[PDB]
Ligand SMILES: CC(=O)N[C@H]1[C@H]([C@H](O)[C@H](O)CO)O[C@@](O[C@H]2[C@@H](O)[C@@H](CO)O[C@@H](O[C@H]3[C@H](O)[C@@H](O)[C@H](O)O[C@@H]3CO)[C@@H]2O)(C(=O)O)C[C@@H]1O
């Protein structure tokens with residue numbers, strides 16, 4: 001088991017065909033999960049499942065530049081469930097991050113931060129037990 005919040009270095013940044021796989025279990029009565037792909041203090045890609053936003057379940061995606069959040073992209077398809085194991089896979093493609101959960105396509109996020117080689121850390125946080133966090137090239 002791994003300690004949350006967990007920082008996964010991405011040596012030399014991200015590159016197309018890099019696949020990041022996160023395995024864990026959502027805690028009972030969870031409120032949030034967050035994956036933050038960082039470029040220094042900036043957040044290139046914030047992936048943020050929210051279990052209770054005005055009694056709705058929603059995934060919020062955004063970018064933070066110079067301490068300011070941008071325009072949110074929201075997804076109503078919500079594959080997570082409190083108490084249950086999950087697999088998140090983030091595939092870096094030339095023009096977007098592609099996210100699949102439990103082997104099903106979920107969403108894609110167009111690159112707002114364009115210096116991919118400088119996105120060199122992934123932060124994992126929220127109401128989860130974290131089992132594994134790794135990457136490979138496909
Ligand atoms: C230490 C700590 O708990 N930090 C939080 C911060 C702070 O709460 C922040 O200063 C706001 O008080 O917020 C963080 O989550 C934010 C992030 O998920 C962004 C993504 O867009 O959304 C923010 O909420 C939005 C909300 O989605 C909009 O509907 C609303 O109009 O504006 C809100 C504020 O911008 C989240 O607060 C953060 O990472 O900055 C979560 C940290 O845990």
Ligand SMILES: [Cl-]
Pocket residue numbers: 051080081082
């Ligand atoms: Cl739930």
Ligand SMILES: [Cl-]
Pocket residue numbers: 093094095096
């Ligand atoms: Cl692409």
Ligand SMILES: [Cl-]
Pocket residue numbers: 112113114115
């Ligand atoms: Cl950039």
